[PDB]
Amino acid sequence: HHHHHHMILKNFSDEFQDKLVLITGGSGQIGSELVESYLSVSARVICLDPEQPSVDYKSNRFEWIQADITNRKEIKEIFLSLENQNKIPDILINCAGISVFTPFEDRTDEEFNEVVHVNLNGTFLLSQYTFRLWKEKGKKGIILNFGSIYGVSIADMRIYNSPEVYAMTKAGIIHFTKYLARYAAPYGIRVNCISPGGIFANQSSDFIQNYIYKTPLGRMGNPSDLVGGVFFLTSSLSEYVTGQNLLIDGGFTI
Amino acid sequence: AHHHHHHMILKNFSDEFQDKLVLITGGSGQIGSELVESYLSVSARVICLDPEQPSVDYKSNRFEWIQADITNRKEIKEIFLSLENQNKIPDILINCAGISVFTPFEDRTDEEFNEVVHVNLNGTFLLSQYTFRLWKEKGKKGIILNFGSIYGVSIADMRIYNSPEVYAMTKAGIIHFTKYLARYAAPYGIRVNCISPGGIFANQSSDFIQNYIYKTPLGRMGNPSDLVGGVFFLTSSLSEYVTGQNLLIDGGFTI
Numbered sequence: 300h301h302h303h304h305h306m307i308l309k310n311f312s313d314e315f316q317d318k319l320v321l322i323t324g325g326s327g328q329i330g331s332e333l334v335e336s337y338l339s340v341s342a343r344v345i346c347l348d349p350e351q352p353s354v355d356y357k358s359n360r361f362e363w364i365q366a367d368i369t370n371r372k373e374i375k376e377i378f379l380s381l382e383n384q385n386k387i388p389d390i391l392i393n394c395a396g397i398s399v400f401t402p403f404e405d406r407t408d409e410e411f412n413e414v415v416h417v418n419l420n421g422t423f424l425l426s427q428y429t430f431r432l433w434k435e436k437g438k439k440g441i442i443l444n445f446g447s448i449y450g451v452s453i454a455d456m457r458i459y460n461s462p463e464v465y466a467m468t469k470a471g472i473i474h475f476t477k478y479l480a481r482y483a484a485p486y487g488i489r490v491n492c493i494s495p496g497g498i499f500a501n502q503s504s505d506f507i508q509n510y511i512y513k514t515p516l517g518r519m520g521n522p523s524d525l526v527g528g529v530f531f532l533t534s535s536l537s538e539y540v541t542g543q544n545l546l547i548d549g550g551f552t553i
Numbered sequence: 554a555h556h557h558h559h560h561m562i563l564k565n566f567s568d569e570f571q572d573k574l575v576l577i578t579g580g581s582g583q584i585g586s587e588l589v590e591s592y593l594s595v596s597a598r599v600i601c602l603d604p605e606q607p608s609v610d611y612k613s614n615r616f617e618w619i620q621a622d623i624t625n626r627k628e629i630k631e632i633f634l635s636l637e638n639q640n641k642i643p644d645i646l647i648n649c650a651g652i653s654v655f656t657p658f659e660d661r662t663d664e665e666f667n668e669v670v671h672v673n674l675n676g677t678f679l680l681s682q683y684t685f686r687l688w689k690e691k692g693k694k695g696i697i698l699n700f701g702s703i704y705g706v707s708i709a710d711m712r713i714y715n716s717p718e719v720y721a722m723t724k725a726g727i728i729h730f731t732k733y734l735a736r737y738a739a740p741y742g743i744r745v746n747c748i749s750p751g752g753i754f755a756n757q758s759s760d761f762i763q764n765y766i767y768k769t770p771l772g773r774m775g776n777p778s779d780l781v782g783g784v785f786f787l788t789s790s791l792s793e794y795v796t797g798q799n800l801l802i803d804g805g806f807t808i
């Protein structure tokens with residue numbers, strides 16, 4: 300017996316080159332980092348966002364579609380166009396999300412409903428159109444949703460303010476991930492979720508200090524801290540992983 | 554006869570692991586041997602601690618087997634002294650050793666119960682303790698990866714068979730130890746995470762496999778290779794900001 304061992308070197312380009320990534324909220328802080336990361340491994344990326352991207356990517360593999368994921372008419376038209384052009388996504392990333400910052404006792408129905416519509420309806424709508432398309436085509440697509448530490452833990456009001464509706468909708472996204480994972484599994488479709496901890500953006504160093512005190516790894520996150528888990532959950536590295544919520548938070552929610 | 558083997562290596566992981574030394578308890582077992590082979594293929598150095606000899610000759614001077622019993626403090630102490638003496642300070646500790654027993658709860662003896670506790674709980678505790686103390690002293694930003702189970706999260710259905718109370722107890726204990734040590738060791742830059750596999754295809758009956766696959770959304774039992782991606786994820790810079798987590802790799806079984 301002579302055993303010959305051969306080492307085939309591969310890159311995340313080999314995973315993602317020429318794959319098509321549909322990302323809602325791709326113009327935002329986390330979304331832009333994911334767009335740039337996928338483009339750098341030769342993926343095609345479609346961004347759905349009412350806001351123009353922050354940078355000119357200067358790339359024939361990038362497309363921005365100005366769209367509002369709370370609007371079924373707009374999303375329906377986009378998916379007709381995608382199907383008509385045979386731009387069938389391999390990966391859907393439901394990154395779009397919003398919040399509101401006044402106290403519970405002052406929450407208006409307009410505030411509450413807007414957070415529900417972006418976070419819950421938007422993730423439902425994109426997942427519904429994408430699931431139906433993949434089912435029609437037999438595509439073994441992958442969905443990645445975005446939760447939050449505040450869909451698992453409860454925000455400390457003394458640290459500042461995260462509202463009740465954000466906790467509600469992020470807990471709902473985490474559970475919808477499990478629901479659609481079980482529902483879509485017979486079609487070969489995987490569905491997981493990433494819940495980031497606090498990402499450094501425009502917070503007062505009063506909040507930052509209080510936040511870092513609760514974080515074992517002793518710092519706030521950056522968008523780059525999420526890319527590895529995003530790639531993990533949307534690549535062949537996680538073929539047997541579905542229905543999971545992955546907390547990337549430096550140990551905040553331990 | 555000639556036998557050709559093809560190992561797909563991710564450059565990110567070869568570049569990442571080529572200077573790493575991985576200490577894996579239970580590395581001779583079904584999952585452990587797959588992890589040893591995978592780490593060797595991305596140029597890591599691997600030390601396997603196991604009372605049983607590996608069943609494969611890896612034919613690599615980057616591999617070392619140490620015959621060892623992780624329930625024996627004196628044995629582990631002397632091994633860790635030798636590792637320090639030889640400049641073999643691990644970068645990654647994988648607590649993969651684990652056992653179970655299969656008679657019914659009402660027939661569990663204390664010898665059975667205590668043996669499962671000692672391998673699963675004492676062994677993970679002891680190896681984590683010697684490794685933590687050494688890293689803290691050397692200032693090494695090591696990574697620990699523990700092994701839970703779906704049955705430390707969910708509860709076994711005995712109509713599918715034998716999975717015992719003490720396995721559920723100790724795997725839940727390892728999952729929570731992961732969170733404890735993650736918080737405890739974080740000030741020293743040490744990360745601690747856990748992987749909980751679903752059931753792995755081996756020598757089960759065809760009736761068992763049918764019943765198991767029926768509970769699994771992805772419609773199949775696991776294979777050791779299904780775990781390598783998450784093992785690599787949690788022991789590489791791709792997870793720098795991830796600590797204290799239990800990652801279920803189970804095809805949706807717990808849903």
Ligand SMILES: NC(=O)c1ccc[n+]([C@@H]2O[C@H](COP(=O)([O-])OP(=O)(O)OC[C@H]3O[C@@H](n4cnc5c(N)ncnc54)[C@H](O)[C@@H]3O)[C@@H](O)[C@H]2O)c1
Pocket residue numbers: 323324325326327328329330347348349350366367368369393394395396397417421445446447448494495496497498499500
């Ligand atoms: N930033 C953090 O600290 C943090 C922490 C945990 C979770 N998250 C979550 O991560 C995801 C991304 O957050 P971010 O920090 O990049 O936010 P951001 O505010 O920088 O980006 C959100 C993006 O969503 C887009 N968007 C808003 N409404 C939309 C709509 N109706 N249709 C389509 N797009 C819409 C916005 O235009 C924006 O580009 C969100 O789900 C958020 O809840 C963020």
Ligand SMILES: NC(=O)c1ccc[n+]([C@@H]2O[C@H](COP(=O)([O-])OP(=O)(O)OC[C@H]3O[C@@H](n4cnc5c(N)ncnc54)[C@H](O)[C@@H]3O)[C@@H](O)[C@H]2O)c1
Pocket residue numbers: 578579580581582583584585602603604605621622623624648649650651652672676700701702703749750751752753754
């Ligand atoms: N195999 C599965 O279906 C499955 C599912 C979930 C979790 N797990 C867990 O995954 C890990 C590996 O499981 P496996 O299926 O490869 O098991 P296995 O029985 O094939 O291997 C276990 C290894 O641990 C070693 N070991 C036993 N006692 C030891 C001791 N005192 N000191 C050092 N090593 C010792 C054994 O010699 C063996 O090589 C275990 O923790 C197990 O509980 C396995």
